[PDB]
Amino acid sequence: KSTALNEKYYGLVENVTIPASLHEYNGKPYSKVGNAMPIHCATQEEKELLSRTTHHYCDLFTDKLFAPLEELVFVRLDENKAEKVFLNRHKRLFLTSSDGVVASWRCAPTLESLNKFMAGTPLVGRDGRVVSLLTAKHGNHYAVSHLEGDGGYFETSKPWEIKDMEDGRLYYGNKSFNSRDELRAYIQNLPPLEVDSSAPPQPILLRGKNPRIILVAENGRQISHQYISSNLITDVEYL
Amino acid sequence: KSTALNEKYYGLVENVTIPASLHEYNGKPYSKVGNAMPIHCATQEEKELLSRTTHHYCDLFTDKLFAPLEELVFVRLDENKAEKVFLNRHKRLFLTSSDGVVASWRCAPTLESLNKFMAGTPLVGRDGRVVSLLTAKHGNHYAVSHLEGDGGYFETSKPWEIKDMEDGRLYYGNKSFNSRDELRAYIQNLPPLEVDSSAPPQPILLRGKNPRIILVAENGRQISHQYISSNLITDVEYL
């Protein structure tokens, strides 16, 4: 029934009827809308089928595009009520996902709520069409995964590795180093970059003051290295 | 002598002495500071050596880190004069470069000047240490290539391909399509992703209202696909 786990609803509550069904994975509840659901709530066998028809959204499976994301959304509380909230495009949460085909990332806008929503809780726009489902949060800030904003994906079956950086340290591939000399010595002695179906690329998120996304080959050679914003919230809880 | 090509200097001109040497490539002038220079001003034989010791800056070779970038810089006009300007972190130019080792990009902050500076013109901070050299410009806005702002690089010997998008088209790898069905059919029938030293990855910048960076394999399979901001100025002139 309820997608909000708290009994007393907070915020601006309006009478909006938004369908959802309730499910469970790994001891945590989640909701679906038809076949649409968060990727992190899917078993591997589910991902292997849902990945073949979905549109590419970070941490969401859906066979049809979601409706457009505007200035506000309604977040489902229960069968008959929803919370009306503004979208915040200034405060962004960094989402990651993998479905066995693509490893996606997104600098997602957020909404702030004192309610405790489960994964997969649907959000609708003014006309009642589903615009997104909830995925991850930090504190009271919930990401809104959609097709706007900075984001991307890597073509690989490997899941993300999520790591933390140290100030002043240097990073290449899977490794970190005290100095450029140590880093360059390592690079020089690696075999040449190679990628194939038995050697899929590994995506890495490095969190910290100067955060990075790295794509590294099975043999240790870098494929890509990117600097992302220190303002992104990368300490996130997948619901 | 002069790194500004106009005879009458505009702006706030101060007595600051900044060393530089004058050079020419393909009939266009450029300046160096010691061994430091813009990548786009180097011959292939020069790149092949300079690439082996340089630090990673988009479109700049330097064996030593540049000094920190703060709120303002002085841009060399001639042997004894420089223009005092503010750094603008709101208006960003998108830079690309390749040195045969890495294909880099950067969302660079800018400075505005009515003077016409050549490529490689040095910029210094309050203490006179070189902070960057000029690379590209759009209008009166010059990029400041440095270690700040979003950016990255791909490990490859290929140079960038720079393309313009068309309304209504979908993009995968090297190709564009009028419908999702045709795009998905194309992907399904490519050989599996493969990369090696005789099949290096190809970086592509797609410019337009919904711009992209795509890294594609020699055989046409994607390695990565990312969405970047339509506010980035991607129409730039390498000086």
Residue numbers in the entry:
A (entry chain B), B (entry chain A): 3 to 241
From the paper:
Poxviruses are large DNA viruses which replicate exclusively in the cytosol, and encode poxvirus immune nucleases (poxins) to degrade 2′3′-cGAMP and prevent STING activation. While baculovirus and lepidopteran poxin homologs share <25% identity with VACV poxin, they are functional nucleases and retain 2′3′-cGAMP-specific cleavage activity. In spite of dramatic sequence divergence, poxin structures from each group reveal a shared core fold and head-to-tail dimeric architecture confirming poxins as a single enzyme family.
Close examination of the high-resolution 1.45 Å D. plexippus poxin structure allows complete analysis of the interactions between the C-terminal peptide and the surface of the protease-like domain. The final five residues in the C-terminal peptide in lepidopteran poxin proteins are highly conserved and bind within the protease-domain pocket through hydrophobic interactions where each residue resides within a pocket of corresponding size and shape. Authentic proteases recognize their substrates through similar sidechain-specific interactions within pockets adjacent to the active site, demonstrating that lepidopteran poxins retain a protease-like mechanism for recognition and positioning of the C-terminus within a vestigial protease active site (Hedstrom, 2002). Notably, the protease active-site pocket is entirely distinct from the poxin nuclease active site, which forms at the dimer interface between poxin monomers, explaining how 2′3′-cGAMP nuclease activity could evolve independently within an ancestral self-cleaving accessory protease.
